[PDB]
Amino acid sequence: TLVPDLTATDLARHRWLTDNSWTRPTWTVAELEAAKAGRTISVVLPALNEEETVGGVVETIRPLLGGLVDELIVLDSGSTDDTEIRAMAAGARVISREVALPEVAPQPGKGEVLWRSLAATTGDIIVFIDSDLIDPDPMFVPKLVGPLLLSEGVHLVKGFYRRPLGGRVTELVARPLLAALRPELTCVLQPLGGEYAGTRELLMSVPFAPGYGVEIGLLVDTYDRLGLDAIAQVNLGVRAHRNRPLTDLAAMSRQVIATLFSRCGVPDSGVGLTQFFSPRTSEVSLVDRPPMNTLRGKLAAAL
Amino acid sequence: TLVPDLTATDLARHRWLTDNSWTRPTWTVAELEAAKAGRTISVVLPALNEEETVGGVVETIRPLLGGLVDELIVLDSGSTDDTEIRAMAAGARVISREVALPEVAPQPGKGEVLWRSLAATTGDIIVFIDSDLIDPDPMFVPKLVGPLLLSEGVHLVKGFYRRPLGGRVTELVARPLLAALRPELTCVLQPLGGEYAGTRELLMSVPFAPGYGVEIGLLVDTYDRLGLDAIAQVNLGVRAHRNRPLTDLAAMSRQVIATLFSRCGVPDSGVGLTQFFSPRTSEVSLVDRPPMNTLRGKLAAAL
Numbered sequence: 001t002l003v004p005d006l007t008a009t010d011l012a013r014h015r016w017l018t019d020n021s022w023t024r025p026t027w028t029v030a031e032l033e034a035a036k037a038g039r040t041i042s043v044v045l046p047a048l049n050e051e052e053t054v055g056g057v058v059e060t061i062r063p064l065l066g067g068l069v070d071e072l073i074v075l076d077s078g079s080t081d082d083t084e085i086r087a088m089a090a091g092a093r094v095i096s097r098e099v100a101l102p103e104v105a106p107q108p109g110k111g112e113v114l115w116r117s118l119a120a121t122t123g124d125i126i127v128f129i130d131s132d133l134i135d136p137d138p139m140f141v142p143k144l145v146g147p148l149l150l151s152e153g154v155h156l157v158k159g160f161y162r163r164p165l166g167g168r169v170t171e172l173v174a175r176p177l178l179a180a181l182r183p184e185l186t187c188v189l190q191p192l193g194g195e196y197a198g199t200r201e202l203l204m205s206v207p208f209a210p211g212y213g214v215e216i217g218l219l220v221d222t223y224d225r226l227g228l229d230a231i232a233q234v235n236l237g238v239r240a241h242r243n244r245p246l247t248d249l250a251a252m253s254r255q256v257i258a259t260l261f262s263r264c265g266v267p268d269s270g271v272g273l274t275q276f277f278s279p280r281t282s283e284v285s286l287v288d289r290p291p292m293n294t295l296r297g298k299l300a301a302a303l
Numbered sequence: 304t305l306v307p308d309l310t311a312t313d314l315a316r317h318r319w320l321t322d323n324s325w326t327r328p329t330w331t332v333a334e335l336e337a338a339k340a341g342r343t344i345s346v347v348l349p350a351l352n353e354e355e356t357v358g359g360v361v362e363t364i365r366p367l368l369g370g371l372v373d374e375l376i377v378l379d380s381g382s383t384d385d386t387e388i389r390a391m392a393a394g395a396r397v398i399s400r401e402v403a404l405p406e407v408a409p410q411p412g413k414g415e416v417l418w419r420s421l422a423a424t425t426g427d428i429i430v431f432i433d434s435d436l437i438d439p440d441p442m443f444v445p446k447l448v449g450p451l452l453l454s455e456g457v458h459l460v461k462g463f464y465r466r467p468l469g470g471r472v473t474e475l476v477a478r479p480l481l482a483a484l485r486p487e488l489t490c491v492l493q494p495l496g497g498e499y500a501g502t503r504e505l506l507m508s509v510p511f512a513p514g515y516g517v518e519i520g521l522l523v524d525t526y527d528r529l530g531l532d533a534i535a536q537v538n539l540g541v542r543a544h545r546n547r548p549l550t551d552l553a554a555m556s557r558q559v560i561a562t563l564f565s566r567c568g569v570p571d572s573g574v575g576l577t578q579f580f581s582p583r584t585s586e587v588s589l590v591d592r593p594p595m596n597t598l599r600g601k602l603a604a605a606l
């Protein structure tokens with residue numbers, strides 16, 4: 001709704017940008033493992049036909065397994081290339097969507113994959129890392145769990161990259177719509193980012209938007225449920241932005257809008273996006289997977 | 304709201320794409336002047352510091368003055384370069400915002416300029432043409448007034464350019480939000496386009512969004528008031544897309560969203576867009592100029 005007591009200048013100076021945003025994280029793996037205090041950490045890589053990059057991402061994280069990281073899983077979304085064998089050969093456990101939750105038939109999309117990994121993992125903390133990253137740095141996982149292990153009351157950590165010496169959906173769609181609908185969340189540098197960590201308590205109890213909606217849906221549901229102070233962001237390093245075609249970005253934008261409208265009380269038409277020059281159509285989903293807590297008691301493998 | 308009776312495939316095949324969309328207009332200036340039937344035509348060029356291009360745009364239209372076109376005006380928005388003298392030297396009449404409507408102090412933005420030109424022009428038909436166009440073709444005005452003069456019941460004509468052998472705000476923001484909020488309007492190729500014509504009756508009776516909202520606001524208000532059949536589009540030729548910086552586009556996108564939310568019953572926060580890396584803020588307007596018919600009777604120069 002209408003928030004005339006908040007201005008763009010207020011946001012640019014917001015205290016949250018100081019206490020909850022680490023622009024130069026300096027934690028070490030030893031002291032983070034020290035602060036685990038009995039909490040376990042699961043790392044999850046969603047993967048659909050990522051044979052060229054998945055091993056390289058797994059390798060940057062594998063030295064943490066058995067120490068800081070307790071579980072390192074690639075959640076395979078029906079890949080037909082060599083994603084699975086290469087992930088296993090890089091030291092990761094690979095789980096299909098069917099094995100993660102066999103009672104429910106798989107739907108397409110990233111959100112489905114991450115939702116199912118809630119049922120396949122056991123960590124009190126779950127880190128998500130895209131498996132298409134070309135230049136993954138081995139400090140990703142430690143910088144994402146920093147605030148969850150040390151700071152009090154953080155439940156979601158979004159990892160951002162500073163741009164070198166620009167994601168267009170993020171800059172033109174996600175952040176401006178957040179300015180209009182959830183203005184405090186414009187403090188989050190990269191709301192659509194694929195690198196983030198969250199507590200199991202939180203993630204088990206919110207729905208999962210399907211497809212490309214999942215990241216922004218999780219951000220907005222966390223904010224609505226727990227306030228801005230429950231969210232943090234950390235600099236993961238200097239990744240430069242990878243190229244995608246505008247037609248991909250247009251359909252992705254449509255789903256980002258539907259997922260945001262869904263959480264912000266805005267009635268979405270449900271009509272997919274047509275593109276011309278001729279016609280090219282795409283589809284949008286308006287139904288989330290319900291909170292995974294909903295399925296408790298009724299699974300062969302317990303939660 | 305929710306429109307489950309309409310699909311993206313329905314839109315890609317919509318009859319409107321046939322009867323109201325001219326992909327190869329063939330009208331001639333002589334037969335269009337023939338069909339004027341006593342209606343006059345005003346052409347308006349909004350202009351803020353456009354000294355390099357304004358004359359070139361005026362010249363492509365000046366041969367029509369006294370024939371098809373009855374008025375050729377550049378509405379100067381406070382330019383400090385040589386926009387005014389160069390427009391006059393190219394054969395156009397130049398009118399400041401103050402001279403167009405002296406009772407009301409000028410607000411910044413394109414929408415303000417076009418709204419004020421309603422009070423400075425007299426044509427039953429008004430054509431708007433951006434004054435920053437690098438390669439303007441002299442068939443622009445004739446192709447825009449085609450449907451208004453010949454076809455029945457058209458009241459708004461949007462001119463589109465086919466891309467050579469892509470506006471990012473149009474493709475990622477305006478068209479996807481229209482898919483969610485006014486799905487029929489995704490049939491319009493370039494909703495944000497600066498080249499369009501409309502009947503005086505229509506334009507006098509709708510508000511004018513300020514700033515970068517004006518084009519999409521006029522499209523949506525026309526659609527709501529008169530239905531899709533009152534709108535047409537025509538191919539103006541092969542213009543390639545000109546470059547703008549993403550930071551411009553981000554603020555422009557924010558205002559497009561606010562203008563669309565305003566017309567579609569969506570409560571906009573009114574908070575401007577902040578951008579980081581640090582902070583850079585911009586502002587958004589939530590107040591339109593009311594329909595110009597509102598001011599009738601109360602102006603020194605009559606309407």
Ligand SMILES: OC[C@H]1O[C@@H](O)[C@H](O)[C@@H](O)[C@@H]1O
Nearest residue numbers: 167192193194211212213215
């Ligand atoms: O699903 C949303 C999309 O956001 C993008 O910025 C990232 O590349 C991915 O996390 C994903 O493809």
Ligand SMILES: OC[C@H]1O[C@@H](O)[C@H](O)[C@@H](O)[C@@H]1O
Nearest residue numbers: 470495496497514515516518
């Ligand atoms: O105001 C909206 C903007 O739309 C853009 O596509 C055009 O270049 C102009 O008509 C304007 O700058």
Ligand SMILES: [Cl-]
Nearest residue numbers: 103104105106
């Ligand atoms: Cl099912």
Ligand SMILES: [Cl-]
Nearest residue numbers: 078106107108
């Ligand atoms: Cl599937």
Ligand SMILES: [Cl-]
Nearest residue numbers: 167168169170
């Ligand atoms: Cl992006």
Ligand SMILES: [Cl-]
Nearest residue numbers: 155201202205
């Ligand atoms: Cl919680």
Ligand SMILES: [Cl-]
Nearest residue numbers: 406407408409
């Ligand atoms: Cl005033």
Ligand SMILES: [Cl-]
Nearest residue numbers: 381409410411
């Ligand atoms: Cl001004």
Ligand SMILES: [Cl-]
Nearest residue numbers: 470471472473
């Ligand atoms: Cl554009």
Ligand SMILES: [Cl-]
Nearest residue numbers: 458504505508
């Ligand atoms: Cl009318």
